């Protein structure tokens, strides 16, 4: 955090001349981002840390194996041995809880990993039979309201969903989504027509 401080006050005054120690400061992190499988906490912290400038990851290919180091995180075998006990103090869950948060300072470009993360800690929860806040709904709230104009179309396609409804509505309660709550605010009449309009097309997940 201090030397946090120390960079983000630092590079104020920035100049195109560093080049060379960009390709050897930033580059034992991104080394040890590589297929490892073994990960660290602070490691992953001060790639966070790191990760809030906007040079030298230009090419958005660190979130493709972020979500392949995800998927080999939120194994079968590895969930076998978070059987038993709690969700909170387990190493696995601190790993994908920073994994989800450095989604967050990702560059701005068309995220196609918005459908994959969703999709992926949705299973997750469910996979670990949990219908309540869960320790990685909070970088993912973080995730969401960032950019938050792509999910609430993702959001007004994908209705009939009842674990997306539930998630989303667990989501925008959080302190971490101030933008997301009155981006859904505006659109009530949108889901209203839509619910009212594709009630009898069904007729059977009416209560739903």
């Not at 990960?39 to 972020?66: N, Q, W």
């Not at 949705?122 to 670990?128: D, H, I, N, S, Y």
């Amino acid at each position: 955090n201090t030397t946090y401080e120390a960079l983000k006050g630092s590079l104020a005054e920035n100049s195109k001349l560093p080049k060379e120690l960009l390709q050897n400061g930033l580059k034992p992190l991104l080394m040890n981002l590589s297929d490892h499988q073994k990960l660290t906490v602070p490691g992953l912290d001060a790639l966070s840390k790191l990760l809030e400038l906007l040079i030298a990851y230009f090419k958005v290919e660190i979130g493709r194996k972020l979500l392949d180091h995800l998927t080999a995180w939120c194994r079968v075998e590895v969930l076998d041995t978070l059987f038993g006990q709690d969700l909170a103090e387990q190493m696995p869950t601190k790993i994908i809880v920073s994994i989800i948060n450095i989604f967050h300072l990702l560059p701005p470009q068309a995220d196609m990993f918005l459908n994959d993360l969703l999709l992926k800690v949705m299973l997750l929860e469910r996979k670990l039979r949990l219908q309540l806040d869960s320790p990685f709904r909070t970088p993912l709230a973080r995730y969401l309201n960032r950019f938050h104009n792509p999910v609430t179309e993702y959001f007004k396609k994908n209705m009939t969903l009842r674990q997306l409804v539930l998630f989303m509505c667990n989501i925008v309660q959080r302190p971490e989504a101030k933008e997301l709550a009155e981006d859904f605010e505006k659109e009530l009449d949108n889901f209203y027509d839509f619910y009212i309009s594709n009630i009898p097309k069904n007729q059977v997940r009416v209560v739903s």
